[PDB]
Amino acid sequence: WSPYADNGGTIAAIAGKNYVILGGDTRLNGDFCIHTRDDRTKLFQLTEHTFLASTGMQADRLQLQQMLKYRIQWYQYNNGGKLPSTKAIAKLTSTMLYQRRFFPYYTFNMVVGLDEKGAGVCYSYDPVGSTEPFRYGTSGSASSFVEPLMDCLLTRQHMELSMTETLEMLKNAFTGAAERDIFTGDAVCFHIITADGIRSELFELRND
Amino acid sequence: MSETTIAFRCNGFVLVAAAGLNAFYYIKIMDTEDKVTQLDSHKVVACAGENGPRVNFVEYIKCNMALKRMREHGRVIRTSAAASFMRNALAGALRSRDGAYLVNCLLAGYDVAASSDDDIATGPHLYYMDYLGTMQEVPYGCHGYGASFVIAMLDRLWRPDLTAQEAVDLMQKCCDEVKKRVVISNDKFICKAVTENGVEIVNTVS
């Protein structure tokens, strides 16, 4: 018996000048089998401008999502009803992960949302909580594929996008990951975050 | 045993020397760290070990000795009493939760009369200690990989009636033989004398 299990799958995000787009796959894997093809626990809304996304062990992301939801509720009760910013939540998350240094959450997390100027931002964490702000990010079983592709198409060191064009690039990156990683597949849930609100969309992938 | 320490007493003094080296695995960071620390006007301790334990151990001894001084009208404490307190702190730590202090020491002092009622025999004293809490008064003593070479030399050449000049010469021969025969580089030594007038640096030894 181990207290750890890897349930598989992949997340990715890309920020723009005034949006961020975030995607997670829906398969939950067991040992040599599949529990379900329609799990929705990888993305978790924290405010109207901020999401948590996690890969790794599903039981640990369920605990971390609830611990954050309660610290954010206490912040509103102690601050006149107001919600914390994306930057404030990102620092809180770092601090909560390090305080469990000695029996760590088995999770690879991202915080994504809009900053105060209204631009997208992605924070990626190692499991004890080191992070930095960046324009894109990915973690999970297919992340070593997707990440070099994002470097190639978005920074172009060896050689402004619309919401629509950015969403097409992620559709194509997940389609490629589903063909070559055995633990990623079935569907992607995408959230588009803008100042107005949050649009959602489901996208089919290969089922084998 | 990467750092060697040497000491010996003669009729009116104790000489104490220690190597300057600080290392990180196989890299020399510096070779001028002073490891012969002064505890009060007439006492020094030379310690061998990693910086963390060495510094935390000598600051703990210095603090307790300063406290004891002012609850006693500022009178100099005897060398055997300081030795007894150090041994009791090393042995205590060995059976504690945090574990032993991994340090090996030589403590040297010159005792001086408190008052006119004082019937103490005045003189120099030298105590060998190890990290477990073993403690023995000795005429000379050493720690580190170089220890065995120097001890044999002193068994051959030391006498109680060496003059100050003969003793400084003898300490320079001891340090040179450590450089000659030990693979681990101990290139600079710092040396101090303890006498009836206090503690002074000996500049002609290196």
Binding site: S144, F145, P148, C152, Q157, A173, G176 | -
Partner: protein, 204 residues
């Protein structure tokens, strides 16, 4: 790991009557770098190139044994060996050491002079082959390379277009790997000619 001790990566891609094969230039001892000028490609004859990754002593030993067998083949048979027979030969030499293996992972590319058909093969270290029609990859940044090619490769490219895709795949993957880099070398092979180019990359 013994396969990652020395560094290096290799990729090959197929097109319309052509292939491109590419390697990095680094040679190391774990994180220390010894040289920045060690490509891992070996030209066997006009139609065939072999790329070898793995431990460097076994790359040098195994490629010398292969060149020795090839020289004796030409004298006995009075012809050049073709790509499918060469890969079968290499697989047989690796399986001979089944229980004490050569720590190498070969990539083989060839073109049949007559027909214009391209043949690619990659093998594991005891000789099991895999013969796709698109691309093969091996070495320290294999997982990243495998994903770059799936995204950029498409059917029916000519020499110059296929070159661009292979260079970008090799440079993006090497930038996420500590043990492969310092630019790349490529061979472009058609029925008619063989071109070779040195590609500029990062210096870390």
């Amino acid at each position: 790991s013994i396969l990652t001790y020395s560094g290096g990566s290799c990729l090959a891609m197929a097109g319309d009557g052509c292939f491109v094969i590419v390697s990095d230039n680094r040679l190391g001892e774990q994180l220390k770098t010894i040289s920045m000028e060690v490509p891992k490609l070996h030209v066997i004859n006009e139609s065939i190139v072999l790329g070898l990754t793995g431990l460097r002593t076994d790359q040098q030993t195994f490629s010398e044994k292969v060149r020795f067998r090839n020289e004796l083949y030409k004298l006995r048979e009075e012809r050049e060996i073709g790509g499918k027979a060469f890969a079968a030969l290499v697989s047989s030499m690796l399986y001979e050491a089944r229980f004490g293996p050569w720590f190498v992972e070969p990539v083989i590319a060839s073109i049949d002079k007559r027909t214009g058909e391209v043949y690619l093969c990659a093998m594991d270290l005891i000789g099991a082959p895999c013969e796709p029609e698109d691309y093969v990859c091996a070495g320290t940044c294999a997982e990243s390379l495998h994903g770059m090619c799936e995204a950029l490769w498409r059917p029916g490219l000519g020499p110059e277009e296929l070159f661009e895709v292979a260079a970008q795949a090799m440079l993006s993957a090497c930038d996420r790997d500590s043990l492969s880099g310092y630019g790349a070398v490529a061979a472009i092979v058609t029925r008619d000619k063989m071109t070779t180019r040195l590609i500029n990359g990062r210096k870390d």
